[PDB]
């Protein structure tokens, strides 16, 4: 019993950054530290996606929430911990917190076909060269708009 698709958030440039890879046994929990794309950025949008493709526009949006009220700092200085937690029922909670202010927000995604899982992993195998190149286009990591 698993996450049948990779789960992650959109990072600067429409890039898919994973927290949980497909076929990870559940329950499972993962976290990474994200940060700002721009100097003095007031907030970030946490856009939760499901799928195997390099760009989020080729994956499936599960939900979005905002984390606002980030104090002004140079780009890349804020520390925003994003946690994906999937429980034994397959329910996914995505939390974001700003390490310095402790400002927090969360979304609950409901567990709610087998054939189309199969082809999404196939289409991803198809488009692997072009997707790899697509990841080479942004060298920075973990930045959020």
Short mmCIF file of the C-alpha atoms (twelve columns), coordinates in Angstrom:
data_MODEL
# 
_entry.id   MODEL 
# 
loop_
_atom_site.group_PDB 
_atom_site.id 
_atom_site.type_symbol 
_atom_site.label_atom_id 
_atom_site.label_alt_id 
_atom_site.label_comp_id 
_atom_site.label_asym_id 
_atom_site.label_seq_id 
_atom_site.Cartn_x 
_atom_site.Cartn_y 
_atom_site.Cartn_z 
_atom_site.pdbx_PDB_model_num 
ATOM 1   C CA . UNK A 1   0.000   0.000  0.000   1 
ATOM 2   C CA . UNK A 2   1.588   3.154  -1.466  1 
ATOM 3   C CA . UNK A 3   1.503   6.682  -2.828  1 
ATOM 4   C CA . UNK A 4   0.652   5.669  -6.383  1 
ATOM 5   C CA . UNK A 5   1.959   8.977  -7.805  1 
ATOM 6   C CA . UNK A 6   4.793   11.294 -6.824  1 
ATOM 7   C CA . UNK A 7   3.678   14.201 -4.700  1 
ATOM 8   C CA . UNK A 8   5.301   17.652 -4.560  1 
ATOM 9   C CA . UNK A 9   5.045   21.387 -4.849  1 
ATOM 10  C CA . UNK A 10  5.571   23.878 -7.662  1 
ATOM 11  C CA . UNK A 11  8.914   25.722 -7.350  1 
ATOM 12  C CA . UNK A 12  10.049  28.842 -9.312  1 
ATOM 13  C CA . UNK A 13  9.510   28.391 -13.103 1 
ATOM 14  C CA . UNK A 14  6.667   25.816 -12.892 1 
ATOM 15  C CA . UNK A 15  9.059   23.049 -11.745 1 
ATOM 16  C CA . UNK A 16  7.810   19.917 -9.951  1 
ATOM 17  C CA . UNK A 17  9.786   19.437 -6.698  1 
ATOM 18  C CA . UNK A 18  8.919   16.194 -4.986  1 
ATOM 19  C CA . UNK A 19  8.477   15.422 -1.321  1 
ATOM 20  C CA . UNK A 20  7.156   11.901 -1.869  1 
ATOM 21  C CA . UNK A 21  8.133   9.569  -4.772  1 
ATOM 22  C CA . UNK A 22  5.628   7.144  -6.209  1 
ATOM 23  C CA . UNK A 23  5.479   3.661  -4.611  1 
ATOM 24  C CA . UNK A 24  6.557   5.003  -1.226  1 
ATOM 25  C CA . UNK A 25  4.839   2.866  1.408   1 
ATOM 26  C CA . UNK A 26  2.236   4.749  3.467   1 
ATOM 27  C CA . UNK A 27  1.900   6.112  6.119   1 
ATOM 28  C CA . UNK A 28  4.862   8.370  5.350   1 
ATOM 29  C CA . UNK A 29  6.146   11.835 6.194   1 
ATOM 30  C CA . UNK A 30  8.658   14.096 4.438   1 
ATOM 31  C CA . UNK A 31  9.846   17.701 4.762   1 
ATOM 32  C CA . UNK A 32  12.141  20.104 2.892   1 
ATOM 33  C CA . UNK A 33  13.095  23.722 3.449   1 
ATOM 34  C CA . UNK A 34  11.936  26.090 0.770   1 
ATOM 35  C CA . UNK A 35  12.539  29.812 0.440   1 
ATOM 36  C CA . UNK A 36  11.733  33.034 -1.443  1 
ATOM 37  C CA . UNK A 37  12.273  33.657 -5.140  1 
ATOM 38  C CA . UNK A 38  12.488  37.494 -4.816  1 
ATOM 39  C CA . UNK A 39  13.930  40.052 -2.460  1 
ATOM 40  C CA . UNK A 40  11.396  41.220 0.174   1 
ATOM 41  C CA . UNK A 41  8.724   38.715 -1.079  1 
ATOM 42  C CA . UNK A 42  5.755   38.981 1.402   1 
ATOM 43  C CA . UNK A 43  4.299   35.502 0.892   1 
ATOM 44  C CA . UNK A 44  4.547   32.137 -0.901  1 
ATOM 45  C CA . UNK A 45  1.875   29.962 -2.615  1 
ATOM 46  C CA . UNK A 46  2.059   26.241 -1.817  1 
ATOM 47  C CA . UNK A 47  0.713   24.500 -4.937  1 
ATOM 48  C CA . UNK A 48  0.470   20.762 -4.306  1 
ATOM 49  C CA . UNK A 49  0.825   18.501 -7.373  1 
ATOM 50  C CA . UNK A 50  0.618   14.837 -8.132  1 
ATOM 51  C CA . UNK A 51  2.487   13.130 -11.023 1 
ATOM 52  C CA . UNK A 52  5.796   12.115 -12.626 1 
ATOM 53  C CA . UNK A 53  6.505   15.002 -14.998 1 
ATOM 54  C CA . UNK A 54  9.199   17.614 -14.603 1 
ATOM 55  C CA . UNK A 55  6.825   20.558 -14.968 1 
ATOM 56  C CA . UNK A 56  3.707   21.025 -12.842 1 
ATOM 57  C CA . UNK A 57  1.616   22.006 -15.950 1 
ATOM 58  C CA . UNK A 58  1.976   18.346 -17.067 1 
ATOM 59  C CA . UNK A 59  0.976   17.053 -13.575 1 
ATOM 60  C CA . UNK A 60  -2.268  17.257 -11.550 1 
ATOM 61  C CA . UNK A 61  -2.965  20.053 -9.053  1 
ATOM 62  C CA . UNK A 62  -4.301  18.784 -5.758  1 
ATOM 63  C CA . UNK A 63  -4.643  22.095 -3.884  1 
ATOM 64  C CA . UNK A 64  -3.145  25.474 -3.059  1 
ATOM 65  C CA . UNK A 65  -2.787  27.514 0.092   1 
ATOM 66  C CA . UNK A 66  -0.868  30.715 0.934   1 
ATOM 67  C CA . UNK A 67  1.735   31.502 3.495   1 
ATOM 68  C CA . UNK A 68  1.758   35.311 3.929   1 
ATOM 69  C CA . UNK A 69  3.521   37.776 6.223   1 
ATOM 70  C CA . UNK A 70  7.087   36.801 5.514   1 
ATOM 71  C CA . UNK A 71  9.294   39.566 6.836   1 
ATOM 72  C CA . UNK A 72  11.348  41.476 4.221   1 
ATOM 73  C CA . UNK A 73  14.673  39.711 3.522   1 
ATOM 74  C CA . UNK A 74  16.920  39.081 0.505   1 
ATOM 75  C CA . UNK A 75  15.761  36.314 -1.839  1 
ATOM 76  C CA . UNK A 76  16.656  32.879 -0.448  1 
ATOM 77  C CA . UNK A 77  17.017  33.866 3.217   1 
ATOM 78  C CA . UNK A 78  13.606  32.835 4.641   1 
ATOM 79  C CA . UNK A 79  13.288  29.244 5.770   1 
ATOM 80  C CA . UNK A 80  9.923   27.701 4.972   1 
ATOM 81  C CA . UNK A 81  9.543   24.092 6.016   1 
ATOM 82  C CA . UNK A 82  7.037   22.202 3.973   1 
ATOM 83  C CA . UNK A 83  5.849   18.875 5.340   1 
ATOM 84  C CA . UNK A 84  3.893   16.202 3.465   1 
ATOM 85  C CA . UNK A 85  2.205   13.739 5.733   1 
ATOM 86  C CA . UNK A 86  0.173   10.827 4.429   1 
ATOM 87  C CA . UNK A 87  -1.638  8.775  7.029   1 
ATOM 88  C CA . UNK A 88  -2.745  5.060  6.946   1 
ATOM 89  C CA . UNK A 89  -6.057  6.100  5.271   1 
ATOM 90  C CA . UNK A 90  -4.161  7.836  2.458   1 
ATOM 91  C CA . UNK A 91  -5.122  11.297 3.697   1 
ATOM 92  C CA . UNK A 92  -2.455  13.904 2.812   1 
ATOM 93  C CA . UNK A 93  -1.745  16.945 5.034   1 
ATOM 94  C CA . UNK A 94  0.595   19.592 3.597   1 
ATOM 95  C CA . UNK A 95  1.921   22.118 6.119   1 
ATOM 96  C CA . UNK A 96  4.142   25.159 5.621   1 
ATOM 97  C CA . UNK A 97  5.781   27.133 8.371   1 
ATOM 98  C CA . UNK A 98  8.106   30.144 8.361   1 
ATOM 99  C CA . UNK A 99  10.938  29.134 10.737  1 
ATOM 100 C CA . UNK A 100 11.518  32.612 12.092  1 
ATOM 101 C CA . UNK A 101 8.036   34.029 12.587  1 
ATOM 102 C CA . UNK A 102 6.419   30.607 13.219  1 
ATOM 103 C CA . UNK A 103 3.646   31.612 10.804  1 
ATOM 104 C CA . UNK A 104 1.890   28.493 9.583   1 
ATOM 105 C CA . UNK A 105 -0.703  27.217 7.215   1 
ATOM 106 C CA . UNK A 106 -1.961  23.733 6.259   1 
ATOM 107 C CA . UNK A 107 -4.233  21.976 3.762   1 
ATOM 108 C CA . UNK A 108 -5.888  18.546 3.942   1 
ATOM 109 C CA . UNK A 109 -6.144  16.596 0.722   1 
ATOM 110 C CA . UNK A 110 -8.689  13.772 0.482   1 
ATOM 111 C CA . UNK A 111 -7.588  10.279 -0.544  1 
ATOM 112 C CA . UNK A 112 -10.446 10.231 -3.118  1 
ATOM 113 C CA . UNK A 113 -8.080  5.036  -11.941 1 
ATOM 114 C CA . UNK A 114 -5.444  2.274  -12.074 1 
ATOM 115 C CA . UNK A 115 -5.166  2.367  -15.863 1 
ATOM 116 C CA . UNK A 116 -4.332  6.101  -16.007 1 
ATOM 117 C CA . UNK A 117 -1.720  5.819  -13.246 1 
ATOM 118 C CA . UNK A 118 -0.038  3.254  -15.553 1 
ATOM 119 C CA . UNK A 119 0.084   5.579  -18.551 1 
ATOM 120 C CA . UNK A 120 1.180   8.674  -16.603 1 
ATOM 121 C CA . UNK A 121 4.264   6.715  -15.554 1 
ATOM 122 C CA . UNK A 122 4.565   5.608  -19.179 1 
ATOM 123 C CA . UNK A 123 4.186   9.160  -20.646 1 
ATOM 124 C CA . UNK A 124 6.853   10.216 -18.124 1 
ATOM 125 C CA . UNK A 125 9.207   7.517  -19.413 1 
ATOM 126 C CA . UNK A 126 8.439   8.728  -22.969 1 
ATOM 127 C CA . UNK A 127 9.197   12.344 -22.162 1 
ATOM 128 C CA . UNK A 128 12.241  11.730 -19.988 1 
ATOM 129 C CA . UNK A 129 14.915  13.283 -22.206 1 
ATOM 130 C CA . UNK A 130 12.937  16.497 -22.766 1 
ATOM 131 C CA . UNK A 131 11.929  16.570 -19.056 1 
ATOM 132 C CA . UNK A 132 15.522  16.145 -17.952 1 
ATOM 133 C CA . UNK A 133 16.520  19.070 -20.147 1 
ATOM 134 C CA . UNK A 134 13.665  21.038 -18.641 1 
ATOM 135 C CA . UNK A 135 15.202  20.561 -15.137 1 
ATOM 136 C CA . UNK A 136 18.568  21.746 -16.472 1 
ATOM 137 C CA . UNK A 137 16.875  25.121 -17.272 1 
ATOM 138 C CA . UNK A 138 16.731  26.175 -13.589 1 
ATOM 139 C CA . UNK A 139 19.827  25.566 -11.443 1 
ATOM 140 C CA . UNK A 140 18.506  27.023 -8.187  1 
ATOM 141 C CA . UNK A 141 16.464  24.773 -5.909  1 
ATOM 142 C CA . UNK A 142 13.466  25.052 -3.596  1 
ATOM 143 C CA . UNK A 143 12.451  28.670 -4.345  1 
ATOM 144 C CA . UNK A 144 8.820   29.605 -4.191  1 
ATOM 145 C CA . UNK A 145 6.760   32.281 -5.842  1 
# 
